[PDB]
RNA sequence: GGCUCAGGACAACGGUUGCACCCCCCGCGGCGGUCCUAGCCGGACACCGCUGGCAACCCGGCGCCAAGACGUGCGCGCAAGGGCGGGCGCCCGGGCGAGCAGCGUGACGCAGCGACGGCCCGCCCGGGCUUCCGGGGCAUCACCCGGUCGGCGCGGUCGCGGCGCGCCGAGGGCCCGACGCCUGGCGGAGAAUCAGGGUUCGACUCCGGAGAGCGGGCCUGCGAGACGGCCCGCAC
């Protein structure tokens, strides 16, 4: 099946090597999870029997995760509304596919329920008084079956705002 | 490539120091995993059949062991292929024979008869200090033994004294210049001597310089240097004091014996 | 005062580096937590660096630098382990990589003579070094960084452009 | 539900030896936990001139 | 374990490094605290009895009954993953040559053990890859490569990596013989020959690699892309 063995590649000089054995089970891969944001249908997580009896769980559909505000040391569970930027490709954003590094929009209710009454970063307050906050995904969906992350702040937040402003 | 581990062992591929006859057969005993590794151990059956001669075949060893007629570190063992290593305790109460397994000068296993005063403890080498679950310190030894909560003064490469009945440290001898050692690896297995110098090369091995009691000097790496006391061995050792004679003297001794 | 000047150069870099909109993603150093740059006081270190050891010294450029390189041995997250070798630079057309030429000797017993051989070895060059052709470099082994790369530069002596090529085993 | 005499042997019935076995197992487990606890406490009493890092028991 | 040497020529293999990029049954030694009827829980199937199909191979329907089997499960908080937590030119303990392990703390989630108590950790054998050096002939084969060369990001993997995908740049190898073609090409430890220097061979005893008519795919399992295991196409 799918494999990542190097026997099927070329040499540094661009030459064909030649195959000297059949395919082996250490060098195998699997079809990507393609985790979809929900926006019969519900949180669906499957399990995979890996090498040595280990268990690897990949998520197919999900909608909630744990997020943090490092500067204010605030951490709660929120709902992810949609994905809005991804460096790798725009197709993933249109299809709302969850992967590490995707910039998402979360709801503000769990945070505004306790914020807007303490001196903090101005921009985070502006997001809080709205209906969504810019955040990022830090976990690896498809390997641990979870979608955690942290709230943006600083130069990177400016970078992403400048990137998605014209749209 | 074999699809799994190896369960056999050709006689011609066996370690040299086991002293197995070429015509004995195609196969040789395969030691099982335990206190010591394949190349740093010897099976029980070899001691009990090819040396002491209390048995003539595999079956007799099987019956003797399954009847529980041998003790190892105070524990009866019933596996003919159980591995016996270095600084171990061998007891057969039926004939009141107590042995500690050490190395001879020529580089082969031997049995040193001992007394009852010192058969309640063994010496072990510490070569790994690490943090376990919850962060609780541990340590390991050359015989696959783990002890929880050691004294901070104990460091790596040291030597530890532990009671057979209870795995509780009694005393520890440090690794330092001016201490008697016993070599246990390579060309100089079995030689007894005192340390003189220590030279370290970053990222690689560490070499130890020792001088025999008669003035001979030799070297080896730190992975096969064992401490046996402070200036004097703590345990009883074979008749000879770890002196490797030359070929001329060995030939003379053979001629005398013939 | 020296610390205050350093932070501004470090702090300032992360700004226009963000305005460099051509980049697909915001490049950052993993160890640091973005948010310290908002602290007006110099209450937290803005840059991360380590010591390679083996008797080597961290160049001032990395410490006073402003670049990002995950594969750099000083400011990145890779370690040097194994064999240390020496060679000369053969090519430097790649982005952050070079080709190092190594010279040795082979002995043929029948004719009781030697032959001169050479090999090509690829290495990753951190932005903390300036190197041209014919310079002498010291490379340290690391984990696979690519298809043909397992080495990273740690030192480099300079050389003059005019210098008759000389077979130089090291 | 409520010559040789053949009747089935019974199963799942509790006899004294099982009660004794369960009680002994509980006692041994409690003893083991207590021994580990006191060893840890003695170790912590020691190390009065150094540092420690261990998992605190919550609850 | 045993048989063979078809395939394969910077590969395999031989010596030498590393995993601070890894997995690991038996065995040995430790450790063992589990969130919200416990004098002992529930239902099945096998063999077996009655009843039957078909040339053979194969199985059907009803029926009470057993578990160190299956399922639930009493219990002192605990799996995986994730955020924050060091320095001011360099150097001068848990451990290192090397800021690596562990821990605390803010949030997620209730994984594993438990109706005669073992999840977990260390060692061992083994495996995977990886540094350096060696590794057939023809120039009536002189230019070759285009995921080919590097960078950034994600996915997948026991795991690093153009291993796969998207974007960007252009690159890499060569008379110290690339690339291409051929080989009645398994390799080494070794064998034959005989002043010394060497020539030829190396199916076969030991180590390693590959295969089970050709080409592919997969379940069980710690471990197999296994064939005295199954599925497909082709030739018999
Ligand atoms: Mg519970
Ligand atoms: Mg059960
Ligand atoms: Mg052939
Ligand atoms: Mg063979
Ligand atoms: Mg096969
Ligand atoms: Mg097959
Ligand atoms: Mg057959
Ligand atoms: Mg078979």
Automatic annotation (TrEMBL), chain A:
- Note whether Ribosomal protein occurs among the keywords: yes
Looking at the UniProt record for this protein, which Gene Ontology cellular component terms does it annotate, in alphabetical order? cytosolic small ribosomal subunit
Q: Name one GO molecular function term.
A: structural constituent of ribosome
Q: Which InterPro entries match?
A: Ribosomal_eS8, Ribosomal_Se8/biogenesis_NSA2
Q: Which residues cross the membrane?
A: none
Alphabetized CDD domains for the sequence: Ribosomal_S8e_like
Q: Which UniProt keywords apply?
A: Ribonucleoprotein, Ribosomal protein
Please provide the Gene Ontology terms (biological process) for this protein.
maturation of SSU-rRNA from tricistronic rRNA transcript (SSU-rRNA, 5.8S rRNA, LSU-rRNA); translation
Q: From what superkingdom does this record's organism come?
A: Eukaryota
The record's similarity note reads: Belongs to the eukaryotic ribosomal protein eS8 family.
Q: Do you know which NCBIfam families this protein is assigned to?
A: eS8
Q: What is this protein called?
A: 40S ribosomal protein S8
Automatic annotation (TrEMBL), chain B:
Question: What's any GO biological process attached to this entry?
Answer: translation
Q: Which Pfam families match?
A: 40S_S4_C, Ribosomal_S4e, RS4NT
Q: Does the keyword Aminoacyl-tRNA synthetase apply?
A: no
One GO term of the cellular component aspect? cytosolic small ribosomal subunit
Q: Which family does it belong to?
A: Belongs to the eukaryotic ribosomal protein eS4 family.
Q: What is this protein called?
A: 40S ribosomal protein S4
Keywords in UniProt for this one?
A: Ribonucleoprotein, Ribosomal protein, RNA-binding, rRNA-binding
**Does the keyword field hold NAD?**
no
InterPro entries given in the database record: KOW, Rib_uL2_dom2, Ribosomal_eS4, Ribosomal_eS4_C, Ribosomal_eS4_central_region, Ribosomal_eS4_central_sf, Ribosomal_eS4_KOW, Ribosomal_eS4_N
Molecular function (Gene Ontology), one example: structural constituent of ribosome
From TrEMBL, chain C:
Q: What processes does the entry annotate via GO biological process terms? A: translation
Q: Where is the signal peptide?
A: none
Tell me the domain of life.
Eukaryota
Entry keyword set: Ribonucleoprotein, Ribosomal protein
Which positions fall inside the Small ribosomal subunit protein uS17 N-terminal domain? 21-85
MF GO annotations: structural constituent of ribosome
GO cellular component, alphabetical, reads:
cytosolic small ribosomal subunit
Q: Which family does it belong to?
A: Belongs to the universal ribosomal protein uS17 family.
Q: What is this protein called?
A: SSU ribosomal protein S17P
Q: Which organism is it from?
A: Giardia intestinalis
Q: What is the lineage of its organism?
A: Eukaryota, Metamonada, Diplomonadida, Hexamitidae, Giardiinae
Tell which residues of the whole protein are contained here.
63 to 232 of 232
Automatic annotation (TrEMBL), chain D:
Q: Name one GO biological process term.
A: translation
Q: Quick one: a GO cellular component term?
A: ribonucleoprotein complex
Q: Which UniProt keywords apply?
A: Metal-binding, Ribonucleoprotein, Ribosomal protein
Example of a GO MF term: structural constituent of ribosome
Family indicated by similarity: Belongs to the eukaryotic ribosomal protein eS6 family.
Instruction: Quote the protein name from its UniProt record.
Output: 40S ribosomal protein S6
Q: Which organism is it from?
A: Giardia intestinalis (strain ATCC 50803 / WB clone C6)
Give the taxonomic lineage as stored in the record: Eukaryota, Metamonada, Diplomonadida, Hexamitidae, Giardiinae
């Amino acid at each position: 099946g799918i494999t990542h063995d190097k026997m099927y590649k070329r040499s540094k000089t661009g030459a064909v090597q030649g195959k000297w054995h059949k395919k082996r089970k250490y060098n195998l891969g699997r079809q990507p999870a393609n985790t979809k944001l929900i926006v019969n249908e519900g949180q669906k997580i499957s399990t995979i029997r890996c090498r040595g009896g280990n268990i690897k769980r990949r998520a197919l559909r999900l909608s909630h995760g744990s997020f943090a505000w490092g500067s204010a040391d605030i951490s709660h569970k929120a709902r992810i509304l949609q994905v809005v930027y991804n460096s790798t490709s725009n197709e993933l954003v249109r299809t709302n596919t969850l992967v590490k590094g995707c910039v998402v929009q979360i709801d503000s209710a769990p945070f505004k329920s306790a914020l807007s009454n303490d001196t903090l970063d101005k921009e985070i307050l502006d997001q809080i008084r709205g209906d969504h906050i810019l955040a990022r995904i830090s976990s690896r969906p498809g390997q641990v079956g979870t979608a955690d992350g942290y709230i943006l702040e600083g130069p990177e937040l400016l970078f992403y705002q400048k990137k998605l402003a014209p749209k | 490539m074999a699809r799994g581990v190896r369960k056999h062992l050709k006689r011609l591929n066996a370690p040299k120091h086991w002293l197995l006859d070429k015509m004995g057969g195609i196969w040789a005993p395969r030691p099982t995993n335990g206190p010591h590794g394949l190349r740093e151990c010897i099976p029980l059956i070899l001691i009990l059949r090819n040396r002491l001669h209390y048995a003539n075949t595999y079956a007799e060893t099987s019956m003797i062991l399954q009847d529980k007629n041998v003790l190892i570190d105070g524990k009866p063992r019933t596996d003919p292929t159980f591995p016996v290593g270095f600084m171990d305790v061998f007891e057969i109460p039926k004939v009141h024979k107590t042995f500690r397994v050490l190395y001879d000068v020529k580089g082969r296993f031997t049995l040193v008869p001992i007394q009852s005063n010192e058969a309640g403890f063994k010496l072990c080498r510490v070569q790994k200090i690490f943090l376990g679950d919850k962060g609780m310190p541990y340590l390991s030894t050359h015989d696959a033994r783990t002890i929880r909560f050691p004294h901070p003064d104990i460091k790596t490469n040291d030597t530890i004294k532990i009671n057979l009945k209870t795995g509780k440290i009694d005393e520890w001898y440090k690794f330092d210049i001016g201490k008697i050692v016993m070599v246990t690896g390579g060309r100089n297995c079995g030689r007894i001597g005192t340390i003189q110098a220590i030279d370290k090369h970053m990222g690689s091995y560490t070499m130890i310089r020792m001088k025999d009691t008669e003035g001979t000097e030799f070297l080896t790496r730190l992975c096969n240097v064992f401490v046996i006391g402070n200036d004097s061995p703590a345990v009883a050792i074979p008749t000879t004091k770890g002196i490797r004679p030359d070929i001329i003297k060995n030939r003379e001794l053979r001629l005398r014996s013939i | 005062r020296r610390a205050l000047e350093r932070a501004e150069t470090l702090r300032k870099a992360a700004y226009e580096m963000a305005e460099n909109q051509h980049e697909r993603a915001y490049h950052k150093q993993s160890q640091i937590f973005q948010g310290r740059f908002l602290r007006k006081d110099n209450a937290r270190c803005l840059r991360f660096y380590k010591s390679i050891g083996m008797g080597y010294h961290t160049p001032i450029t990395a410490i006073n630098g402003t670049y990002i390189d995950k594969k750099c041995p000083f400011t990145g997250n890779v370690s040097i382990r194994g064999r240390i070798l020496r060679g000369v630079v053969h090519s430097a057309k790649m982005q952050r990589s070079i080709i190092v030429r190594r010279d040795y000797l082979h002995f043929v017993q029948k004719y009781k003579r030697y032959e001169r051989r050479h090999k090509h070895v690829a290495a990753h060059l951190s932005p903390c070094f300036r190197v041209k052709e014919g310079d002498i470099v010291t490379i340290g082994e690391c984990r696979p960084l690519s298809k043909t790369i397992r080495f990273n530069v740690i030192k480099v002596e300079p050389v003059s452009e005019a210098a008759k090529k000389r077979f130089s085993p090291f | 539900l409520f010559k040789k005499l053949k009747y089935p042997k019974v199963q799942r019935v509790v006899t004294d030896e099982k009660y004794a076995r369960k009680q002994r197992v509980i006692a041994e487990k409690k003893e083991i936990m207590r021994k580990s606890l006191q060893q840890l406490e003695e170790y912590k009493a020691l190390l009065s001139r150094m540092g420690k890092q261990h998992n605190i028991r919550i609850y």
